[PDB]
Structure formats: structure tokens, C-alpha cells
RNA sequence: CCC
């Protein structure tokens, strides 16, 4: 008696995700037997057929777990089912959840309904079986669909510090990018490359005016907040001063200058609120030597540099160990959910009840405040 | 020789229903091992306030099927999953459907996504194992949720002859009962007793002015139609003309006397259109020698006999042998789903693909049009 | 609010 396998389902987002983990030693990272992600945008490019997310998951979760089980050769083998319970569109959630319930009942095996974000949080620990980073740590999630700063004290205890009020970073970046006629799968990945290439070049006379909501450095309300929806409007009007119309016949020298400044400012804003948080509550961060930057936009170098430079020498004699997962794990996927559930199962010895329905809005601090949880055995 | 068991799921109504069937022999009727129904009420008024039916289904399917699998003694025994694909609310539907698919992937067994009404039509064939009634036959579906007349030429070939354009006879005999001073599970069944207990003792001088959906003249739907939502009103307008709440404090002789007439005038309307359709389309019925009347309200004895007598009018295109299934089969349940699945699997050698999604509104004629179906090896 |  040693080793268990885990079937993990993620459906909070646009992409249906299924994975299988062989948790062969409680001493070692699990091995990934199967990792399937069938996206809403992957049936569109070579598709021109636009589907609705809850229907996408409904249609793809069956064949996907079927494929996964075959690839993994593990149908008669799963021990735990983990599944994203919230937060998200409760249609898209019920897709995965009600299905995951099917597996569990059919197999007579435990189900864990997991916090989407706890996945993002806990993923950079899978690599080392939860030795790095050790709690407490802080984690900046920066995806197309979240932008949040989170102190994590224990597995059963997490506090959101700073959080967006409008859209997420990647969204607004992608949006700015698309207004400059980028089209790609990841619009802002493309726009970094663009800036990267011809640096000592771009019209240094172009100095557009972008904001960075520093009011929280004066009129402080109730919680601290990121905010990105202001950027695309600020771009448009700066265009509407100097050639919005020129959209097209600007040089492949200038367009690469609107880019770097749009990026710089929006990364300035994050750094601004990050600064304003650590400054104001040194007590909480006293005890933490590690900083995670997971999510999509983790993989930006300009950001990574700013983070390492403009923070990790401001908390006095407590540099930060920055850890950046592979964006192999940073995008939504069902692996994080699997890992997160191994951590719950092992460390709390909790599972979910079969009556758990989805949770539209699920504050991370309410992780175990909600019903569903029961102790496993002892 | 070999037999097989079926797990069948019905999640289209308000009630969460699951069944296991032993299809032990292809020359016998199958037996039921397990049949449960978690009615929406039992987790509302005795819990908190009124709960949405999709969350009901989501909350109850899993515990419910676990139990049924325990009772049936067959968690490892199921060879086929039958579940209601449509028609209804896609949130309700998809609770059971997404779940059902989970069972199917985990046990690696076929799924059949079943049409609710196919359920009701076929169920009388269950007991005789497909011999009685023989195709063609017509069926009259009179539940709290349907009032519909149907010709059935083959498993895969059903044609709706007349259908309600508003509420169903049940919903209508219920509100009428509610207004006469009744409550309960079957508000209208009760109304039957009140007049039954003392069939003679009723003020034979209380004649009431109820209508019969006044449209034998001014309407251009290509198709014949029932309607009931007038009767509640007619009754009210009438109870004005000769004493409001009098009902509540009238003799045994009067509460009944009007109830008999309301119950008459509704059945009258039903026999009326039933007659229209038998008259309009004579040779549609050429070889029909069987009339099934099923659904909640089919248990009523004035109906049963109005049917028997008033389409013995002049026995013409056919002389009908009536069949009235029990109420434990007529009211929504998962057994009829399971049976429909048997029929489909065995006769048509068909199953559903795991990509099947709900269908909100599913024409019975389109039973096999829609996507999903796939041949075993006919 | 809600499939
Ligand atoms: N006005 C409408 N426009 C588009 N779809 C509609 C409309 N009214 C009803 N629908 C139907 O309802 C569903 C779409 O709406 P719904 O909000 O339930 O889906 P969604 O946008 O993907 O949300 P969620 O993912 O949270 O369930 C589909 O099943 C669709 O057929
Ligand atoms: N180098 C990069 N610069 C800017 N955005 C990026 C980069 N790499 C990835 N992204 C963004 O990452 C997001 C992916 O979100 P998710 O799939 O949730 O990680 C997309 O919106 C991308 O535009
Ligand atoms: N003996 C009866 N006479 C008239 N209506 C009935 C009788 N029994 C049950 N019903 C009705 O059955 C309906 C519910 O539909 P069903 O889904 O078939 O149970 C309710 O409207 C009841 O009032
Ligand atoms: Zn995410
Ligand atoms: Zn029904």
C-alpha cells in the first residue's frame, strides 16, 4: 500500500482541462500520466464556429476524460477525483462538477471540490512536494482572467491583499495590443516580442501619457486594488492626438514605441500597488522569504525584471526569492487542481460531500468556511 | 444466454429521479432493483426557502444514485446508462446528463440520451416486453405537465396530433381544486374523492357556465390544440354570479356539485378535440387498435370511462382496446427512461456519443435528426 | 443573478 492516482478536472474558464497524476510516493512530486487541454479558441482558428463556454465543457468533458484515462491506462486505477468547484460561471463549473460526481459514484472514490485560485497558488510546490516555497509566501497571479496579490499563511489559510476591480492585466494588455493590430493566440505575448527586437530604435520623442491610479497613495478607501480598464481609453486618445488614423502607415519603428510605454505603465501600476501593500503592513511579510509570480503574464521579462528590481530591495534585509513556474503550468489547467487536492487530502484529511454545487463567487479566505467538507476517515 | 442492467436518470422536471433495471432476459419484462425520487419540496419548506431546480438536481443526483447503487446491490453491474437529454430546462437536464456521462466514462459503458416523452409513450410496453401495445397505437398524455395526443408508428416514429397551447389538464384541475378548498400532493385526485364519496348527493340544480376553449372557428394554427387556462377563470367568474367563498362554508351537497361539473367540462374539451382528430384524419388510424391514456390524471375514473364510451361513439377506423398504466409509472420517473433506452438499444441498435448536450425543445419527429446518435452494429 |  503506497501510491495513489488522481483524476483532476478544470472547467472554470474557456478551456476544458483533464489530467491524471500518479502520486506514487508521498515523498516525491507526482508523475503526470495525462494532461489534456481542449480550448474554446482551438475549435475556432481552424473552425470559424463560435461556441458558448458551458456548452464547450458539456460537449468535451466526456471524450477528454475518456482519452485521458486511455492515454494514462488508469481507468480501474483512480483513487481521488479533484475538481474546480469555484469561482467561475456556474454553468461552466457544473459541467466539470456534475461529471466529476459521476466518476466518483461509479468508482466509489472521494471527490474534492477545489478553489480555482488555490490551484494557481499551490502549483509551484508540486515540483518539490511542497518544500518550495514554504509558508508563508506571497503570490502575484497575473493571467488574462485574474490579477491578484495573495499572502498564503497555511494550506487552509490565504488572504487576498490586492485585487483588480475592473478587468485583469492580460486582458487589458491583449486589448491594447489588438488596437495596434496584433491578432495572435496570445496578443500580448506577441507584443513583448515586438518591443524586444528593435530596442535602440523606437521614436524616443513619442512620450504618450498613461495613468497609474496612485490615488491609493492619498485617498485610501477600504481594500487596495489593481485597475486596468483605464488603459485602452488612454491609448486610444493619445492615438487621437498623434495618429489614431495612422493605425496603418506608421513605421515598424514607432508602433514598437507605443508598445513599450503601454506595457511599462501597466507594469508600473502593479509595482505601485505591490509597493503600497508591503510598505503599509510589514508585520504580515516579516516572516516570508519567497514570492511567486504564476499566471499567463508571469513569462514577461520586462515584468520579471521590474519585480526583482523595484521590490526585492525595499523590505529591509529581506530580499525576495522570486519563483516563476513554467507557463506550461501557469495557464489554466487541471494539473494545479490535482496538486491542490493532494495537498488538501493529505494535509487536512478533508474531502467533499457528493451534494456540493458550484460557487459563483468564492472568497479564498472562505476555502473551508463553506459546506461540502467532511473529514475523510480519521 | 446473458442479461444486463441499466442505470437510468431523469432530471428534467422538478424531481430528481434514479433507477436501476435488471434486463435479465430479452423474452421477459425487466425488473426494477431500485427506483428513487427526491422531490423538490423535501429540500425547501423543511430546509429554508424555495430552491432552484437545477441546484436541486446538482445537489441530489449524486447522493441519490450512490444510494440506488447500494440498494440495487449492483455498483459494479451496470451495462448501459439512460438519461433524459430533453426536453426541459438545460440546467436541470445537464445536472443528470453531465453526471450520467461520468458513470459512462468511468465504467466505460454506453450512454443513451433519451427523449422525455418517448419515456411516457413506451412505458406501457415495459410489462409485456414490447408486445402490447403493438405499433401503430396512439397515446394520450395527461399529467400535471403534459396534455398531448400522439400517434406512434414505430420506436423511432412518433407524431404529435394535438397538444396544449398553455397549461396542462393537471395544472388546471389543480388550480380549480385549490379554489374549491383543497390542498396536497395530488390536489385534483382529492377533488375526485370529494364527489366520489356521495356520487348521488349533489345539488342537481347548480348548473355552471364553464366553456370549452372557444376556438372551433377563429384560429389558424396548422394543428389541433388543447387549452385549459380559461377554466380557472370561468369558474371564478361563475363563483361571482352566485356566491364567492360560499364554497368554504357550503354543504357536502354543493362543494362537490360544482367540482363534478368543472371536472366534466375539462374532460369534455379533451374528448371534443380527440374526436376532431380521429374525424379529420381517418386513415392515419387505419391499423391502430390500441389507445393508451397515461400520466397522473389517467388514474381518474370518469375520464377512463368518458374515453371508453365517447370514442365508442361509432367504432369506425378501429375499435380501441384501452390501456391505463399505474400512477407510479405515469408520474415522472427514471424507469420509463431506462425502458426507452432498452427499446432504443435493442430494436434500433443505437447509442449516444459522449458529446451529447441538452436539447431545450426537441421535436419528437426529430428524435433521430439531431446530433449524437450512433449505431452499435444493427 | 443564474444555464
Ligand atoms: N437571449 C439569449 N441569447 C443567447 N442565448 C440564450 C438566450 N436566451 C436563452 N438562451 C439559452 O440559454 C443558454 C445560454 O444562456 P446562459 O446564460 O445560460 O449561458 P452562458 O452565457 O454560457 O452562462 P453560464 O456559463 O454561467 O451558465 C443556452 O443554453 C441558450 O440556448
Ligand atoms: N510575454 C508576455 N507578455 C504579455 N502577456 C503575456 C506574455 N505571455 C503570456 N501573456 C498573457 O498571458 C495570458 C494567459 O492567461 P492564462 O491562459 O490564464 O495564463 C494571455 O492573456 C497573454 O496575453
Ligand atoms: N384520480 C385523479 N383524478 C384527477 N387528477 C389526478 C388524479 N390523480 C392524479 N392526478 C393529477 O396528477 C397530476 C400530476 O401529474 P403527474 O406528473 O402524472 O403526476 C396532478 O395535477 C394531479 O392533480
Ligand atoms: Zn485561472
Ligand atoms: Zn413527464
Amino acid at each position: 500500500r503506497k501510491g495513489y492516482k488522481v483524476l483532476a478536472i478544470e472547467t472554470s474558464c474557456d478551456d476544458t482541462c483533464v489530467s491524471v497524476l500518479d502520486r506514487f510516493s508521498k515523498s516525491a512530486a507526482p508523475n503526470v500520466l495525462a494532461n489534456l487541454k481542449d480550448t474554446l479558441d482551438s475549435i475556432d482558428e481552424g473552425g470559424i464556429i463560435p461556441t458558448k463556454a458551458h456548452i464547450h465543457h458539456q460537449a468535451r468533458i466526456g471524450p477528454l476524460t475518456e482519452r485521458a484515462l486511455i492515454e494514462s491506462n488508469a481507468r480501474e486505477g483512480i483513487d481521488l477525483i479533484c475538481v474546480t468547484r469555484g469561482p467561475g460561471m456556474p454553468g461552466s463549473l457544473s459541467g466539470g462538477l456534475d461529471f466529476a460526481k459521476g466518476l466518483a459514484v461509479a468508482w466509489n472514490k472521494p471527490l474534492i471540490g477545489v478553489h480555482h485560485m488555490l490551484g494557481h497558488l499551490l502549483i509551484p510546490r508540486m515540483g518539490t512536494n511542497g518544500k518550495v516555497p514554504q509558508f508563508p509566501f506571497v503570490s502575484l497571479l497575473v493571467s488574462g482572467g485574474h490579477t491578484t496579490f495573495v499572502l498564503s499563511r497555511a494550506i487552509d489559510d490565504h488572504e487576498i491583499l490586492c485585487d483588480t476591480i475592473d478587468i485583469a492585466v492580460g486582458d487589458s494588455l491583449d486589448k491594447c495590443g489588438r488596437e495596434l493590430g496584433f491578432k495572435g493566440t496570445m496578443i500580448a505575448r506577441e507584443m513583448e516580442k515586438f518591443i524586444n527586437q528593435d530596442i535602440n530604435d523606437q521614436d524616443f520623442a513619442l512620450k504618450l501619457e498613461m495613468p497609474s491610479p496612485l490615488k491609493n497613495s492619498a485617498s485610501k478607501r477600504n481594500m487596495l486594488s489593481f485597475s486596468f480598464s483605464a488603459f485602452i481609453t488612454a491609448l486610444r486618445t493619445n492615438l487621437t492626438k498623434l495618429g489614431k488614423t495612422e493605425i496603418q502607415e506608421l513605421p515598424e519603428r514607432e508602433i514598437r514605441s507605443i508598445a513599450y510605454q503601454v506595457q511599462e505603465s501597466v507594469f508600473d501600476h502593479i509595482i505601485n500597488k505591490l509597493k503600497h501593500v508591503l510598505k503599509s503592513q510589514p508585520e504580515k511579510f516579516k516572516n516570508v522569504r519567497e514570492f511567486v509570480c504564476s499566471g499567463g503574464v508571469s513569462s514577461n521579462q520586462r515584468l520579471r525584471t521590474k519585480l526583482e528590481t523595484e521590490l526585492g530591495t525595499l523590505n529591509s534585509t529581506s530580499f525576495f526569492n522570486f519563483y516563476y513556474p513554467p507557463m506550461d503550468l501557469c495557464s489554466d489547467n487541471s494539473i494545479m487542481i490535482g496538486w491542490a487536492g493532494i495537498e488538501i487530502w493529505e494535509s487536512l484529511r478533508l474531502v467533499s460531500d457528493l451534494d456540493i454545487c458550484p460557487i459563483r463567487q468564492w472568497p479564498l479566505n472562505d476555502l473551508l468556511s463553506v459546506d461540502g467538507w467532511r473529514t475523510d476517515q480519521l
Side-chain angles (χ1 to χ4, degrees), chain A:
Chain A
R1 292 296 191 256
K2 61 183 296 147
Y4 60 84
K5 285 150 197 136
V6 168
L7 192 134
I9 293 159
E10 160 58 31
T11 68
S12 61
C13 54
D14 291 309
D15 323 318
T16 332
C17 311
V18 201
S19 36
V20 173
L21 313 190
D22 186 26
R23 167 47 154 208
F24 55 83
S25 206
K26 301 218 201 198
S27 300
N31 182 239
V32 177
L33 291 189
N35 183 43
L36 303 191
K37 191 163 133 134
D38 152 343
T39 39
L40 187 44
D41 322 88
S42 158
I43 329 299
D44 255 66
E45 185 272 10
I48 314 194
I49 42 116
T51 309
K52 185 137 55 171
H54 85 105
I55 305 293
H56 178 65
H57 297 328
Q58 287 204 239
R60 301 286 179 96
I61 195 63
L64 214 47
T65 94
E66 199 176 24
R67 185 167 291 283
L69 282 175
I70 302 272
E71 297 195 354
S72 62
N73 215 285
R75 186 166 51 68
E76 298 157 279
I78 300 306
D79 296 291
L80 188 65
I81 303 109
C82 299
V83 63
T84 299
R85 179 181 171 181
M89 302 278 100
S92 294
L93 296 170
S94 55
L97 198 40
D98 300 334
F99 179 88
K101 285 191 195 148
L103 299 173
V105 170
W107 283 331
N108 198 15
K109 294 300 182 196
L111 183 107
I112 300 178
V114 171
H115 204 294
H116 178 67
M117 196 160 283
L118 181 62
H120 285 291
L121 289 185
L122 289 190
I123 185 59
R125 285 165 51 89
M126 186 177 81
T128 72
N129 205 24
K131 293 199 179 160
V132 180
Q134 203 54 224
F135 305 104
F137 55 101
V138 303
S139 337
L140 166 57
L141 281 35
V142 296
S143 67
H146 337 282
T147 296
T148 326
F149 191 52
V150 176
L151 162 64
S152 313
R153 275 180 290 271
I155 292 163
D156 67 347
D157 175 17
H158 310 260
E159 173 175 327
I160 297 168
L161 305 176
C162 182
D163 195 14
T164 166
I165 70 198
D166 46 30
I167 71 178
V169 64
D171 206 288
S172 86
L173 264 186
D174 288 352
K175 208 108 139 51
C176 287
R178 196 202 34 74
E179 175 100 15
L180 311 193
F182 297 70
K183 64 171 172 200
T185 169
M186 293 175 296
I187 297 253
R189 182 71 194 207
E190 315 265 7
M191 203 206 321
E192 209 213 336
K193 301 306 178 168
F194 223 88
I195 161 265
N196 286 326
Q197 291 147 71
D198 297 336
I199 299 279
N200 299 306
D201 152 309
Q202 290 145 215
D203 197 325
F204 286 65
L206 268 197
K207 281 172 194 141
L208 38 58
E209 302 237 278
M210 297 296 191
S212 148
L214 356 117
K215 314 173 207 168
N216 263 170
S217 151
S219 175
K220 296 244 204 173
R221 175 165 316 282
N222 283 177
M223 201 183 61
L224 258 191
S225 323
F226 304 112
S227 165
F228 299 109
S229 87
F231 282 98
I232 187 48
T233 59
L235 181 64
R236 272 165 172 169
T237 66
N238 287 308
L239 250 49
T240 323
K241 202 135 299 180
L242 330 165
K244 74 187 295 154
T245 182
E246 297 163 359
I247 33 158
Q248 211 15 66
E249 337 74 39
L250 314 126
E252 201 145 8
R253 185 191 135 280
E254 268 187 346
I255 60 169
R256 204 191 312 275
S257 203
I258 298 100
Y260 176 70
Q261 298 172 84
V262 160
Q263 183 173 262
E264 203 55 23
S265 62
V266 79
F267 287 162
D268 279 333
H269 174 10
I270 297 185
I271 294 281
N272 188 232
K273 293 288 172 275
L274 278 179
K275 255 203 222 156
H276 273 112
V277 166
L278 301 156
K279 177 172 84 179
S280 88
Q281 296 188 282
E283 75 256 352
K284 296 180 182 297
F285 317 106
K286 183 180 182 306
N287 192 11
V288 331
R289 311 138 57 45
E290 307 143 316
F291 177 80
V292 174
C293 186
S294 74
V297 176
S298 52
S299 63
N300 184 314
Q301 194 52 49
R302 184 69 216 106
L303 186 51
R304 294 207 187 178
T305 315
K306 294 184 79 63
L307 294 164
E308 296 186 7
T309 311
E310 312 168 48
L311 299 178
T313 305
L314 230 81
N315 191 179
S316 262
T317 275
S318 251
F319 247 57
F320 271 131
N321 284 351
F322 292 87
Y323 305 149
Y324 312 72
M327 176 178 73
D328 290 345
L329 295 169
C330 279
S331 318
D332 294 328
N333 60 82
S334 55
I335 308 203
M336 70 185 36
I337 309 306
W339 179 245
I342 291 161
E343 286 229 65
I344 292 166
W345 193 28
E346 283 174 18
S347 316
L348 311 189
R349 313 276 317 267
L350 295 176
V351 293
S352 307
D353 291 347
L354 285 179
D355 62 12
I356 60 151
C357 320
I359 307 177
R360 256 221 190 223
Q361 283 269 347
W362 193 5
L364 196 49
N365 64 34
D366 276 321
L367 179 67
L368 314 183
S369 92
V370 181
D371 60 356
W373 303 112
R374 59 173 156 92
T375 179
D376 189 54
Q377 309 303 355
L378 299 180

